[PDB]
């Protein structure tokens, strides 16, 4: 059920196929280890704001920002 690369017009020889795939694999740049980054809420912007003592954003912005995981 994976999405495969497709070649739509012409057929390359095995040498041309290897060169095409090899250069595209080289173009596959990135982190080399893509995973969920370490959470660190220290000094998050939502703690910096002034909230009125009765402001509903204390629920729907501040708390949800801290508690969401």
């Amino acid at each position: 059920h994976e999405a495969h690369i497709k070649v739509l017009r012409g057929e390359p020889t095995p040498e041309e196929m290897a060169a095409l795939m090899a250069v595209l694999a080289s173009a596959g740049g990135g982190p080399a280890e893509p995973v969920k980054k370490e959470r660190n809420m220290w000094g998050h912007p939502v703690d910096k704001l002034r909230y009125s003592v009765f402001s509903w954003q204390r629920v729907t912005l501040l708390e949800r920002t801290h508690m969401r995981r």
Partner: peptide, 18 residues
Amino acid sequence: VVEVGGRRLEVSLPGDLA
């Protein structure tokens, strides 16, 4: 895996290019 015009084709690669 690569498809070419309706062929399935397998290509093997070093787990090393980055």
